[PDB]
Amino acid sequence: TTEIMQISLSHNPADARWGEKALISTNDQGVTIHLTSHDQLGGIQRAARKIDGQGIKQVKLAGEGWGLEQSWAFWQGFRGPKGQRSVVWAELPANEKTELEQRLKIIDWVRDTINAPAEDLGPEQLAKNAIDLLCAVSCDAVSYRITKGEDLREQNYAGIYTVGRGSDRAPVLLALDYNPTGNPDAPVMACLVGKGITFDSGDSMKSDMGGAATLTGALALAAARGLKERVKLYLCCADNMVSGNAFKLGDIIRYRNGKTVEIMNTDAEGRLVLADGLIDASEQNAPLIIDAATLTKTALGNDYHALFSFDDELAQALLNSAHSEHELFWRLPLAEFHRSQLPSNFAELNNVAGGAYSAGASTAAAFLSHFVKNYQQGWLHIDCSATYRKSAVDQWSAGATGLGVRTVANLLLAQAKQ
Amino acid sequence: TTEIMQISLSHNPADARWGEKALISTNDQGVTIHLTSHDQLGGIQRAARKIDGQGIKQVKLAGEGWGLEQSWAFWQGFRGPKGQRSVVWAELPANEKTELEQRLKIIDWVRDTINAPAEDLGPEQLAKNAIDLLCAVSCDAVSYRITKGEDLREQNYAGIYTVGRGSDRAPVLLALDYNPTGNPDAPVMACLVGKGITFDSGDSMKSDMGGAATLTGALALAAARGLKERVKLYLCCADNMVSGNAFKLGDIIRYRNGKTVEIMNTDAEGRLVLADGLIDASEQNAPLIIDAATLTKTALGNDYHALFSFDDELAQALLNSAHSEHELFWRLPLAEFHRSQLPSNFAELNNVAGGAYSAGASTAAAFLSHFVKNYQQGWLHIDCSATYRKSAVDQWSAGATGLGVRTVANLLLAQAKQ
Amino acid sequence: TTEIMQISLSHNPADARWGEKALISTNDQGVTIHLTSHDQLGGIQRAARKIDGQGIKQVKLAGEGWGLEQSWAFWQGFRGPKGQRSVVWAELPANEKTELEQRLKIIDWVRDTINAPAEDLGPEQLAKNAIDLLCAVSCDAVSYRITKGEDLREQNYAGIYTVGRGSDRAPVLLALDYNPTGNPDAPVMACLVGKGITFDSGDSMKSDMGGAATLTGALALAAARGLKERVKLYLCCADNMVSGNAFKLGDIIRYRNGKTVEIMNTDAEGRLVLADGLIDASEQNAPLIIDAATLTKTALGNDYHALFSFDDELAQALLNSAHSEHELFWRLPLAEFHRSQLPSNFAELNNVAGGAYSAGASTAAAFLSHFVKNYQQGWLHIDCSATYRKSAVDQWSAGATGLGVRTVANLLLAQAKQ
């Protein structure tokens, strides 16, 4: 019979009765959230987690202070994978209510897609959902081509075809073209390459296609905000099975750019599918290429997305977007010497450095750079380590966080001078 | 523009400037290799490894001392799996240049075959390559019969059919007959039985068909040296998948000689395919049977091939060949009591001793002896533990070494009084 | 009889006879090192490793190009833990030859100390060696006080006394005062706090006192270059035994600043000894505090030292020093939220985050910040992950690298406007 929980913002701290530095308090007026000057949006999100934690499922944001960002902060923390939670929003200006509504649609899409079980999300399905998303936000501007199964082998997509080899669900390359102007000669300004491993050998496993989902949301959100420039999106999608008829260990893949790659580590195959997408993206000769992949051991925890580039100014541009969108990103090393740290006894390079050069995300980024024509300027690689939460934490429920979507979209908009 | 590196042999040790007991030195004349009286061929091989190690890819053997064995020693160490290295040989007598050229062709075949990825080398492919090799060296003398897939089940090759069961690449038995004389009644003097596991559950994995390749090279090399006697070769070939539709754990195989074998250890399946080959070889009633299998924990390291027989005089004959061909072999125990050390709760015997009789290569040899009619005379088993090098070492690059080919071929020639 | 190997620098690449992009070549003139425009000092160091690798022990740097940095680059790579290698230097200006000679003395001290077996380097010994080093470079300016064994308990050094508890070699705090001016009222400008674990439960173990050695070298090198400002150095030294009479698991330490710390992880005890040093350093009210500790899982590899601070401008100052001294440093995250990520069921905080907040070096830095009075300005923490090499690599032999000494010394000099 309605009478929903009202949630309000105060800058005076709670009574002593609630204990020290109590973040939330609750009386007849509803729940109050107690803020200081330092990190209000973090405090609001943690409060939305606790409120959810107490088993409350419907809330009304009430009283003053509920701008776009406070409201979004709340929702990010209040929401859960089961999707039972509702929120009666506060009054907002016309601009901000549309921004809220399109964030909700597009970023919750990203969370659901990453949270979905791998049985319900195969390679071609993931491609289909991405198209469906982009065609909802702006259909006239979008076109695509799916190259699936044998068509991949037939056109020398050795990386994607090989990684997918073992499975009943055929590997898929989605090439998607977001072209607003109509002009088919219009120059391609950015290429986005996403890791779409829909099943991984060794439930963190369902987060291995999170790079694809996150860039699909980034493009969609950018377009929803009216991105004028043309953008190509490559989702490199495959199941990654290692046992038996997948024939993975020791396999050498000849890529179209002449590179040979031994598979030493049958689990590190996201970089193998990405290499093919990176070859296509470099043939477009765009001034920006961004690729995103999860799970490439990290010392940032799940708190930061990591970025790797040789281009200092471009790494800074992304960090600037990340700050403007209140998302945590952090730069990690990628120097020239990493490119030598993947030798092989049987091929030009190995897929990992292994135990001979105890490395991780820098070497994974270094490996991809062998498939980017001008790797030194205009290329970004994102290890999406803020994408998934095994268990619930302070500010997040279990599962996909949705982080990174705002930040990349902001960067593309910035390129287009918007 | 040519001007190749010259490599020469000296018996005076290097200047103090190079350090103590310096093996190689380099000046305007090229690289000198410094030898003592003890183990020159070992020293030469290690020097060829270092020279390769310094990134030199083309050399000319120069000056005096470069006999057949010094030259071969060098090549063995100089060569690498990638096969970029060339050597301008020294002048040799007619006899020795043909021996060098046929060693090169046949032993490098063995290395490439063992080094090849398992994706590029299935059961039937391995059989096809072996035939191709033997028909290159002497075609008129060779005939064969391939029994593949269902034909194996249909003819009660339960061991080979079962081990291969799980895979998309069907198991294969190659029966190959090297008969020079033409006379089809000519008595079969030796049977060779090779372990051809083309894929193994748990990149050392691609070396699990090395017994087959090594005996295929042995026969080929013997024939190239004009082996007059008739020899049968059985390559027992299969993928060894253990997960899922391979249905491996606890399976009982009824062999044609009435034996039942439980599979306790799903990884120890090379002996299972060999058992079928050993049944066929014993029906030929030849005075010599040799079988070869890799990976049957060893305390010889990768430095020695191991041999097992009940026949003292025959074990000595092989050790004599091994010394004549400067290859390292070493005898390990095989007494009667080992034959009791494989009991089973559900079958006549288990495929391993397990943890009840902490054993390894002796018990594996003991198990095979239950499939050799007269196991007590005229049967040799070789655990090929010198066949593969995970990482590069003093005298060898990574990968297949090619060792054992010379030694077995020398033994067959000895049988034929040649 | 002398006739030493001459090593020279060329900018033309080697003959084809040596292979592609050959770094070194060797003829009658000696070894030539072949450089391009990109990273000459890296190339020179790798060449010194290879030359050492070929077993050469005495060299003469010859011809033009051998400035201070080229010469140092060479030595860093040429040297080995066994210390058999000699180098006849090239002619240098007066300034640079003294810089070379004092680098050699001070940085090779750091390497030997870190390379020394733990049996030959107890807590008090480490303190004694540090004093000895600093008194060699400038004796009149140095004074100290050693607080050892029971004196630590008696003066509420609970962290150091507890970590050391189990061992036959008593824990030690070295407070060392480098005061050039003489004036005892002279303001203390920097405090340096070093982790001196002389034995660690679970031969990478002997590198666990590398923070202490590295800062001892930094101060010594700075003083050798005439550092005018006053600096205090705190070496927090102890054996870290965990089994039996060490009584480590679950112990709660009450520190002088009122903090209680449960020991959840008996291996993470370097931070426990540092906490006491950090309390002392904060009582000096200096505008700079630097602490250094090894082994606090990293994704930089052994290629970068990591730094953590809340002070942006100070983190940049250190990165600037690191670039001026051609050493690799890299910043890692340390935000306010990390300070909450070490809760305890039994004390104010745990010594680690554990498996509840899968973290590493950020949480270790966050933990130390609870013992720095004004942690927000003027405090740096260095995880010394470039300090030790388990095995030999491209540019380094096995063992202690000596990196970080130049960089910290440069920062102190910069503070003093020098």
UniProtKB/Swiss-Prot annotation, chains A, B, C:
Its EC number is 3.4.11.23. GO terms for biological process: proteolysis. GO terms for cellular component: cytoplasm. Binds 2 manganese ions per subunit. Its cofactor is Mn(2+). It catalyses: Release of an N-terminal amino acid, Xaa, from a peptide or arylamide. Xaa is preferably Glu or Asp but may be other amino acids, including Leu, Met, His, Cys and Gln. Mn(2+) 2 binds at K195, D200, D208, E269. It is found in: Cytoplasm. Gene3D superfamilies: Zn peptidases (3.40.630.10). One of its GO terms (molecular function) is metalloaminopeptidase activity. Pfam families: DUF3663 (PF12404), Peptidase_M17 (PF00883). The active site is at R271. Keywords: Aminopeptidase, Cytoplasm, Hydrolase, Manganese, Metal-binding, Protease. InterPro entries: Leucine_aapep/pepB, M17_PepB-like_N, Pept_M17_PepB, Peptidase_M17_C. Belongs to the peptidase M17 family. Homohexamer. Probably plays an important role in intracellular peptide degradation. PANTHER family: LEUCINE AMINOPEPTIDASE-RELATED, PEPTIDASE B. This is Peptidase B. It comes from Yersinia pestis. The lineage of its organism: Bacteria, Pseudomonadati, Pseudomonadota, Gammaproteobacteria, Enterobacterales.
